[PDB]
Write a protein that binds this DNA or RNA. Structure first.
Lengths: 119, 330, 129, 129, 129, 129, 129, 129, 129
RNA sequence: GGAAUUCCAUUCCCCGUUCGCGUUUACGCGGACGGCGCAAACCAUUGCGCGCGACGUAUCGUGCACUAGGUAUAGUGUUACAAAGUAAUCUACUAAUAGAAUGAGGAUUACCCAUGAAGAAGUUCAACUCUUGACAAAUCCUUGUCCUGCCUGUAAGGAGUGAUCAAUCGAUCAGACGAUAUUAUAUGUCCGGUUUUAAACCGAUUCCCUCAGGAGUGUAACUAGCUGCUUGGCUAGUUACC
């Protein structure tokens, strides 16, 4: 039973899916790399650090290039501070906020998908 | 080869030649426009110095020599030691160079002299040590810069490194268009000789001199002559980003690995000479002598071929590989 | 007889095999090199030494280059050039039987057999997960 | 075509003739030597130079050795005991016709024909009296 | 013995010979000259001296005028553009016997025999090419 | 394949031609000369030497004597008044092919072809008017 | 009548001949250039001066380029990759008749006629030997 | 007529005579050398000089060597083992007539005639006893 | 042949002549002396040298003494009381024919033939009046 | 001016003999001999003069007179008035107040913080180490100009000639070398005397105790290059300058 496993990153129909695979877990920092050339690969990390006495502070990073070298590359960098008092009924509520934030139709993923700001 | 005379003299001692030489066996060799082929040749002298009377011509029966003084039985422990010690000098890279290679290594020591100059200065720009980047372009360190970005400071020095960009094409194009399309000969020599004693007392000294000429025949040195390089004058350096110096030295990095790798070779032909110098003792006493010579055209060269350690492997070109495989690639 | 001979390095099913040829034996370091072709050449070395009073070490180094060229402006300019290496040592004690040296070689041969995880990890640009 | 060929120096009537062979051509000075021993060898050199603005100075050298037998420790090596040096320098003006250059050669040939007073006196270790 | 006599310097085959004649013996220099004026005659000199403790030098000198468009007996200027010069130095050591002094004269005769590359370059205004 | 041969320099259409012959090779300079004395003959010298690491320089000199009122074989003073001089120098870069050097040879032949304005001005002692 | 006219420099048999044309006469230096741009044209000059009191000295220069097209700053401009230079100086005495001037012009035409050793050495890039 | 001629120095029967011959007359020294190797030859000199206001002085020198063979390093050479040196000086005053000079020569010829005590001491290695 | 011979100097009708005889040749100077003592002798010398570059100069000295008998310390010695010294120098250039030298000798004999004014002035102790 | 007057006047107011010298020799120059009270008046005026602690042996510790003498002799105290005229942006709090490029770095979250590897090396192999006079003017005859009846530690202690020793009638004390050589040779190192008579001389472990303790140990040239020579095949070779 382990979650350092292979997961689908881009749900692109059922044919052109980009399924990313685990690569490295050095220094407590996870790393996923898609199965292609290294310069043309997606990259997902994850790390949890006890920042202070009452916080845990996640770190997720996603790098998406343009497709043998990459012309340019995107960079997601998101953090999540959760206190130690949050129960599992409250930790599932936080992930429901992130899934509801980026659901197809909401204004923030409809502004990223059209090179636009908030109008 | 010690001295010997061919004027047949005759003595007479009271109580019979003193020396003897066969005909001058002159053969000629072929001649093509690239290389001049060798030729067989043989001279010697049977000679009787001191003493009943002997004939100096009939003293070939002592010595391991035929009557014509051409054929000489060399020992197999001399012939096999001479063939392997020549052929290991071929692979190990201990030989002499033609004029076409002494001019090819010199113009391939001008890539490596100047691709040390850019790469030690270009990696001084990434690191930010601009005090070292001005030494390698022969500029003055007293210059203070006007721009503050790293790529903006590099274009200010463009009068400094564009001479190095064109002088590498002065050495890159002379290889691929002129020097690598030439005939390129090489020469390796090793001599082996021992001392034999027979009983007819006679002590000889049979030695073999093997000289093998061979030239570069490689498939991937006709491949390096197929390639090109970009013209640094014809490239607008302002639009193209700062990592294009790395993408400009990619045909140079194929050369300095392509030359310093070991090279296949085919041979033209070579000569093999055999020298016996000896004496004999025959109370009736006598002393006869030989100093003879016979060249051969027989080839001592394996059909598996030899992959010679390259002459382009040099002190300079191994430093120019030590920068690109450590700084620009690692 | 001598072991410093020719052998095949890449087994491309007969058509396009890369054989390797003996070139040099300088300074105790043996050296092989690939066949005559229009490409960059391979290198295989092998040097044996007595490091300590109770150990023997075998050093093998293999280099694999790739060069790709495009036709831009009526010339053949080299676009991409890189190498991947191989570097292994093998410390063997001097109390090893010849039948115990047959076990070390089969330990390395079974490690890289097709289907095992370590060649499965390299051939897919992945790790062991 | 070339006049730098092999010729015969001492003509002993067909038997024992000393031939002399082209070897070296450094610095514009032609050089013939005999068999390749270089120590017991005959040697003939010729050079041509424009001395003045209206003269031409030919230079001919001949070294005649006297071959001998050296014995050191029972080993017989031939060596030249002494050498004789002929060294002539011919100055011809540039205004000379080729028929006048044939008169200069006949003057040197007739000077040394066997019977004239100069080659008579040298052959008897004497002078002109 | 009397070597200082009359002889024929240029041998034109019976007719047209230039018979040189003795004229002077001052300071041990035997001098031959033809029957012409001093500016247009053939002049041959010969002298013997011992140069060092080991060697003897013979000095032979021949002067041959230019014959083409000659004005016989006329005054002809400049002097150096009408006359040729020969200069010979024969350094023979004292160890050489009579038979070795015969071999040196046969060398000088074989050097100037017709057809050899040295006198064929003189009569053709050429060098060694 | 030796180009150091005999050739005809001045052509008069069969009879009356002047044939020039090779003479000398002093100091890297190859010399031709016709059948006359050294002061009245056609002389050609052609020396090849590489000037830099980029250019080969040919040096060609031709000397032709004045013909009218010539005294055949005579002495003619001053020397600089009776002989014409040509001095050609040609520079060919090392990047030229064999087809490039064929056009450089054709470039000199069309300049001096009879009927063109350069050799029809030298033949009249005139300039370009 | 005028000799400063049009001629053909490189005669490749009717088709593709490089013909050259009068363009300039300033400073006493004639100038011929072909029907190209000033970077890719052939250039032929001519000049006459009285150097000494007794000599007339010509100076004729020919420039033969190799055409190309260079990209400078992203724009292709016609320019010559390399030029070759002819440079001769013909010194003719003032005492030379019109017939003796024709002998010098015939001497330069026979020097560069096809088949002679000097133009055959230039085309095949070999030395004179 | 002349007395610088070939004369016989040793009347040894009719076979073993050593007939000496003139060689040189430099600086007024009439020098006779026999006809063999110079290291194994005899020597006779003579010179006349006005010594004082009323005297003439002759100076005769005679060398007689012993014929041997030097062998150094195996190479044999004709040399002289040792030499005998006669050195005699005659002073004649200028007042002596030709009848007086004959009586001086009769004093020398009677001094060395066989039977007299002085030549019988040299031919026995003796003194005056 | 040789011309250094005996001749008669003073021709007193056969009886009472003075014949003069060759005696010395050293330092390139001929010397004839008469059959007397060295003090009461006649003496004739002759020498030839190349004086300038274009001259040849003769030097002839004739001594005619008056014989006497001087009492020196009571002893009678043959001596000359006074001598008469003829000393002439003849400069003949190198451009002179042998038929021009015979015109000189006829001029020196007609100058001294009997009946001419110059030998009449010496034989009477008079001048030319 | 005046007074008295005794009133013409005052007073007062060579010769010779003879030896030596010298070639100026029938001459020179020498030498030796010979020749207010008194007083007086002249009279109405003068002078005069318990309760605290400790021990016991009811004991210790702390808070003219007068005194003597007697023979009657001695001593001593413009607001105002009297009045047309003088005198003069966001904040908080609320009816008010104050305050304005990166980091698996942190946050009370549009805030703060900080900076501007190789190695034909080795093992204790996922961890390390090693190595790189003209003239003008007015007012006009006028100017102005030219021993003990001592005591005790009782065989001890404290307190008032001769006599040893000598032996004599004597002394006492009152060249090597297991070095070298060229080998009797250089060498290395450390006249009498007499007698010795072929020579010379004289003339953790032990220990201990009261016992769970202590002690101790690279660059530009310059030659050449010919189908010919070859006594070790050529396809290069030596010189300069860095």
């Amino acid at each position: 039973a382990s979650n350092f496993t292979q997961f689908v990153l881009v749900d692109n129909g059922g044919t052109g899916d980009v399924t990313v695979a685990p690569s490295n877990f050095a220094n407590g920092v996870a790393e996923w790399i898609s199965s292609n050339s290294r310069s043309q690969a997606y990259k997902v990390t994850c790390s949890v650090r006890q920042s202070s006495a009452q916080n845990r502070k996640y770190t997720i990073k996603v790098e998406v290039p343009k497709v043998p070298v990459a012309a340019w590359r995107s960079y997601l960098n998101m953090e999540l501070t959760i206190p130690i008092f949050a129960t599992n009924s409250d930790c599932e509520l936080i992930v429901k906020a992130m899934q509801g934030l980026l659901k197809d139709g909401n204004p923030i993923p409809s502004a990223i998908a059209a090179n636009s700001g908030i109008y | 080869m010690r001295a010997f005379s061919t004027l047949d003299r005759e003595n007479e001692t009271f109580v019979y030649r003193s020396n003897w030489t066969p005909g001058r066996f002159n053969s000629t060799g072929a001649k093509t426009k690239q290389w001049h082929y060798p030729s067989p040749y043989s001279r010697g002298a049977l000679s009787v110095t001191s003493i009943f009377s002997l004939d100096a011509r009939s003293c070939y029966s002592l010595f391991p020599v035929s009557q014509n003084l051409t054929y000489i039985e060399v020992p197999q422990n001399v012939a096999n030691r001479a063939s392997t010690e020549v052929l290991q000098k071929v692979t190990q890279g201990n030989f002499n160079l033609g004029v076409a290679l002494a001019e090819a290594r010199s113009t391939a020591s001008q890539l490596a002299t100047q691709t040390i100059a850019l790469v030690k200065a270009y990696t001084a720009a990434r690191r930010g040590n601009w005090r070292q980047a001005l030494r390698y372009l022969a500029l003055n360190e007293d210059r203070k810069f006007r721009s503050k970005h790293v790529a903006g400071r590099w274009l200010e020095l463009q009068f400094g490194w564009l001479p190095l960009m064109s002088d590498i094409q002065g050495a890159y194009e002379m290889l691929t268009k002129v020097h690598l399309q030439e005939f390129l000969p090489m020469r390796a020599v090793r001599q082996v000789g021992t001392n034999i004693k027979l009983d007819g007392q006679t002590t000889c000294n049979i030695s073999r001199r093997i000289v093998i000429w061979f030239y570069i025949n490689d498939a991937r040195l006709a491949w390096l002559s197929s390639l090109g390089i970009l013209n640094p004058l014809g490239i607008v350096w302002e639009k193209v980003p700062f990592s294009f110096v790395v993408d400009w030295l990619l045909p140079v990095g194929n050369m300095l690995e392509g030359l310093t790798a070991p090279v296949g070779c085919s041979y033209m032909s070579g000569t093999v000479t055999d020298v016996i110098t000896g004496e004999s003792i025959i109370q009736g006493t006598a002393k006869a002598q030989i100093s003879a010579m016979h060249r051969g055209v027989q080839s001592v060269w394996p059909t598996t071929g030899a992959y010679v350690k390259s002459p382009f492997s040099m002190v300079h070109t191994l430093d120019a590989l030590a920068l690109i495989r450590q700084r620009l690639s690692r």
